[PDB]
Structure formats: structure tokens, C-alpha cells
Symmetry: C5
Subunit: 29 residues, 5 copies
């Protein structure tokens, strides 16, 4: 359903952000 699919999309995108910010932390530290 539309609510479930949107929440899944949010969860996936937040995990992408978490991976990118970890890559930034690795480049800097």
C-alpha cells in the first residue's frame, strides 16, 4: 500500500545517507 511503500522508500534513502556520511567520516578521520 501507499503508506507502507512511502515509509519503505524513506527507510532505504536514510540508509543511503548513513552510508554516504560514513564514507565522509572515513575520508576526514
Amino acid at each position: 500500500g501507499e503508506i507502507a511503500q512511502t515509509i519503505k522508500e524513506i527507510a532505504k534513502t536514510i540508509k543511503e545517507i548513513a552510508y554516504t556520511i560514513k564514507e565522509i567520516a572515513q575520508t576526514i578521520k
Copy 2:
């Protein structure tokens, strides 16, 4: 409908953030 529309707006904004943070990571990466 208000809940569906608001969480869609949140999803779109988070996708904007995901693109920008990747641009930042790439500029600083050797």
C-alpha cells in the same frame, strides 16, 4: 490525503539531501 502527502513530501526532501551529501562526499574524496 494529509498523512500520505506529508510523508511523500518527507521522502522527496530526504532524496534531495541524499543527492547533495553524495556531491559533498565526492568533492572531498581523492
Copy 3:
């Protein structure tokens, strides 16, 4: 209601973050 108000607060804060990360990208690289 509490759920509606919290989701509104989340949406507003994420928009603030999206603008700050765009300002970081602009300051670093334009």
C-alpha cells in the same frame, strides 16, 4: 493530534537540513 504534529515537526526540520546541506555544497564548490 500528537502523531500529526510530530510528523509536521519532522517535515519542517528535514526542510531546514536540506537547505543547510545545500549551503554547505555551495560554500565548498558552488
Copy 4:
């Protein structure tokens, strides 16, 4: 549970918003 979890998310996102503003301010002329 749902109300409390989304309140926790709202608070954590406000913490992130403060930290990202600190980063933006340090690098800005």
C-alpha cells in the same frame, strides 16, 4: 510505541540539524 518512536526521531533530527549548522558556519566566510 509509534508516537514515542516518531517523537525520538523528531528529537534526533533536531540534534542533526544543529550539528550540520555548526559545520556550515565553520566553513562559511
Copy 5:
């Protein structure tokens, strides 16, 4: 599960909050 997905989002956002603080400390330190 809606509750479980929102809990997973809350956990990922807490990871992001920690990582961004580590980045801010390395840049400002």
C-alpha cells in the same frame, strides 16, 4: 511491519547523529 520500519528509521537516524558529530569534531578540533 509499520512499527518495525519506523524503529529501523529511528536507529539509522541515531547512527547518522553520531557520525555527523564525529565529522564536526574532526573539522573543528
